[PDB]
Amino acid sequence: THYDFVITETKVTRLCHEKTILAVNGQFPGPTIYARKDDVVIVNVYNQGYKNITLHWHGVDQPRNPWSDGPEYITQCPIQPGANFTYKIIFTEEEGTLWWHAHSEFDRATVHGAIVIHPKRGTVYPYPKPHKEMPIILGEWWNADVEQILLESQRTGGDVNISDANTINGQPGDFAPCSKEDTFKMSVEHGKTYLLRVINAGLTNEMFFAVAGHRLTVVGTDGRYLRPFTVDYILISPGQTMNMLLEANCATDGSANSRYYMAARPFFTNTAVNVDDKNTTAIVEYTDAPPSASAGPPDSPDLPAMDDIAAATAYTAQLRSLVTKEHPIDVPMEVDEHMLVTISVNTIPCEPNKTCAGPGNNRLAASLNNVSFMNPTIDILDAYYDSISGVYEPDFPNKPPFFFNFTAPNPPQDLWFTKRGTKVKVVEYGTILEVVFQDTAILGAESHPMHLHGFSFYVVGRGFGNFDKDKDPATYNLVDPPYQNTVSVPTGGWAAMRFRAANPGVWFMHCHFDRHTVWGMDTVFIVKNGKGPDAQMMPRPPNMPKC
């Protein structure tokens, strides 16, 4: 239950381009944290790298413990080069696959890895014990320094350069330059079943994913078992994890291929905008088949076309919590407070005496309810703990300030603009929230993976167009809605979720596309202390990084 994570400057080559990246213990992707349900894990983080950094345990509630949650300038100031900080990871309701990642700037492009939470002793999976288990991390690779990619977009006000490759476990795969020799490979044995622990650790795109010749039985997401369902492909958004069983059925007598491509490729609908649309591949190999069975290329799966919105919708519609006696659910039935939260990409005016590269030569930005979040220089959590004025404003609104036909295409240029602020939403302990995310069509309808730190939530509804508060709740799933920490809000649509705000602390909510995070598609929930010691935020640890 104890790890040392040393942030290292590590030389890595992909696509024949060598660079020095930030990595953890010289590993890219970083090491896997293994735990069992309800463990407490300690991670000592030693920043031996060249820049300010933080780490986050994605999807871990961290009850009463925002001090170890990680988001830069939200719960802590950064771990400075040469400093260290000890994180306490408190696992509770989570069982399945989560992941950890840097939560500063774009550092998670290389600083990330898996979290595996096994059933605690005396319990078992709700499915037959897999023969083997394999994390499958989807990610991106840039040849340039990721920090320079970020800094250039900050200077120009234009869009972030697209990655040069999509990756599986750090490796672009068979169809990229200088990549075929080190394509990720896993061995399978006929008749055995494998648990694929799929994590989308990329920065930019929802991804379709599939394995040639093999159906996938999905059994969990975001640390919560799902009602099982079998598919030919999945959709997975940055922030999300998806667990699925693969059954190695294909013949090993030489009558069938012994090698099968695992493959992923973006789901992306904006034809006007650049995307790293390259697929990434890995190989499933049946090891006890004859050499002739691997004479040709591995078989390829059919992936939905990149703009196949129906295929995305059809996967997401199948997600439902597993509800049994061993795995109960608690859907909040009576809502104390409703929020409508419009999600937009935006512009702000270019700075004086400068030309910017964003739409209309303005500077790109993003907003929730038309507030574009800007990080403070004193982290929110210290400001809340010490009652420091002038850091944040506690009036993030429950509804957009101007109602319009949110999803109508090509809104007029005057609706592009937004305004910066550091606004948070303060709620009493135990408040039951229904949060409805409403995508707008400003600068292009787009699916956004909205993520809430400190909580999972029940996704009770979704649809296309504008949420109708007097009609859409009538068909909510109040029985087995999926329990997620990151929800794909539909392209040009809405998603409704509910949760009890019963975790006292300071909790980031943001789109899990990093460019939208930095542009300001974020806010913060401060959940005040309740009554009793179990409803009190933990005290500040003695060695928090200084601001």
Ligand X SMILES: *[C@@H]1O[C@H](CO)[C@@H](O[C@@H]2O[C@H](CO)[C@@H](O)[C@H](O)[C@H]2NC(C)=O)[C@H](O)[C@H]1NC(C)=O
Ligand Y SMILES: *[C@@H]1O[C@H](CO)[C@@H](O)[C@H](O)[C@H]1NC(C)=O
Binding residues for Cu(2+): 56, 58, 101, 103, 448, 451, 453, 510-512, 516
The nearer residue to Cu ion, 286 or 406, going by C-beta atoms, is 406
Question: Residue 500 Cβ, how far from ligand Y at the closest point, in Å?
Answer: 34
The residue from 47, 75, 97, 279 that contacts ligand Y (CB under 6 A) is: 279
CA 338 → CA 112, 143, 173, 437, distances in Å? 34, 44, 46, 11
Question: Residue 312 Cβ, how far from ligand X at the closest point, in Å?
Answer: 26
CA gap 224, 421 in Å, rounded? 34
Question: Could you tell me which stretch among 72-80, 182-190, 209-217, 294-302 binds ligand X (CB under 6 A)?
Answer: 72-80
Binding of residue 128 to ligand X (CB under 6 A): no
CA gap 392, 225 in Å, rounded? 37
Judged by beta carbon distances under 5 to 8 A according to partner kind, the member of ligand X, Cu ion, ligand Y, none in contact with residue 261 is ligand Y
Judged by beta carbon distances under 5 to 8 A according to partner kind, the member of ligand Y, Cu ion, ligand X, none in contact with residue 58 is Cu ion
The nearer residue to ligand X, 29 or 520, going by C-beta atoms, is 520
Q: Total residues at the site for ligand Y (CB under 6 A)?
A: 20
Binding of residue 48 to ligand Y (CB under 6 A): no
Judged by beta carbon distances under 5 to 8 A according to partner kind, the member of ligand X, ligand Y, Cu ion, none in contact with residue 52 is ligand X
Residues in contact with 157: Cβ distance below 8 Å, sequence separation at least 6, in sequence order: 350, 356, 357, 358, 362, 363, 364
Q: Token digits for 208?
A: 């379709």
* % helix, strand, coil for the chain, step of 5: 10, 40, 50
Binding of residue 508 to ligand Y (CB under 6 A): no
b/e per residue 416-453 (b: at least 16 CB within 10 A): bbbeebbbbbeeebebbbbbbbbbbbbbbbbbbbbbbb
Radius of gyration of the chain (CA): 23
Contact code string over 175-214 relative to ligand Y, x by CB under 6 A = x---------------------------------------
Binding of residue 300 to ligand Y (CB under 6 A): yes
Beta-ladder partners of 341:
437
In the range 432-471, which residues lie near Cu ion by CB under 5 A?
448, 453
Binding of residue 52 to ligand X (CB under 6 A): yes
The nearer residue to ligand X, 74 or 117, going by C-beta atoms, is 74
The nearer residue to ligand Y, 68 or 486, going by C-beta atoms, is 68
The residue from 25, 27, 32, 84 that contacts ligand Y (CB under 6 A) is: 84
CA gap 394, 424 in Å, rounded? 5
Question: Residue 238 Cβ, how far from Cu ion at the closest point, in Å?
Answer: 8
Strand order, beta sheet including 40-47: 17-24, 2-14, 40-47, 84-90
In the range 321-380, which residues lie near ligand Y by CB under 6 A?
352-353
Map 288-317 to HEC letters: CCCHHHHCCCCECCCCCCCCCHHHHHHHHC
534 exposed, middle or buried (CB, 10 Å; 0-12, 13-18, 19+)? exposed
The residue from 111, 115, 263, 341 that contacts ligand Y (CB under 6 A) is: 263
CA 296 → CA 171, 185, 256, distances in Å? 21, 16, 11
Q: Which of 230, 218, 289 is nearest to 260 (CA)?
A: 289
The residue from 16, 40, 408, 479 that contacts ligand Y (CB under 6 A) is: 408
Residues in contact with 323: Cβ distance below 8 Å, sequence separation at least 6, in sequence order: 227, 329, 479, 480
CA gap 467, 399 in Å, rounded? 12
CA gap 504, 69 in Å, rounded? 13
Question: Residue 452 Cβ, how far from ligand Y at the closest point, in Å?
Answer: 29
CA gap 97, 198 in Å, rounded? 8
Do residues 314 and 201 make contact, with C-beta atoms less than 8 angstroms apart?
no
Question: Could you tell me which stretch among 4-12, 13-21, 66-74, 143-151 binds ligand Y (CB under 6 A)?
Answer: 143-151
The residue from 109, 117, 137, 149 that contacts ligand Y (CB under 6 A) is: 149
Beta strand spans in 150-258 (E): 165-168, 185-188, 193-200, 206-211, 216-221, 224-231, 234-236, 241-247
Question: Residue 42 Cβ, how far from ligand Y at the closest point, in Å?
Answer: 12
Do residues 57 and 101 make contact, with C-beta atoms less than 8 angstroms apart?
no
The nearer residue to ligand Y, 52 or 300, going by C-beta atoms, is 300
| End-to-end Cα distance, the chain | 29
Question: Could you tell me which stretch among 113-121, 146-154, 285-293, 528-536 binds ligand Y (CB under 6 A)?
Answer: 146-154
Binding of residue 153 to ligand X (CB under 6 A): no
Judged by beta carbon distances under 5 to 8 A according to partner kind, the member of Cu ion, ligand X, ligand Y, none in contact with residue 77 is ligand X
Beta strand pairing call for 40-47 and 84-90: antiparallel
Question: Residue 425 Cβ, how far from ligand X at the closest point, in Å?
Answer: 18
Question: Residue 151 Cβ, how far from ligand Y at the closest point, in Å?
Answer: 8
In the range 482-521, which residues lie near Cu ion by CB under 5 A?
511, 513, 516
The nearer residue to ligand X, 68 or 342, going by C-beta atoms, is 342
In the range 327-386, which residues lie near ligand X by CB under 6 A?
349, 370, 377
Where on the chain is the footprint of ligand X (CB under 6 A)? Answer: 52, 77-78, 80, 349, 370, 377, 401-402, 415, 417-419, 546-547
Residues that bind Cu ion (CB under 5 A): 58, 239, 448, 453, 511, 513, 516
Where on the chain is the footprint of ligand Y (CB under 6 A)?
A: 83-84, 144, 148-149, 152, 161, 175, 261, 263, 279, 281, 300, 303, 352-353, 405, 408-409, 543
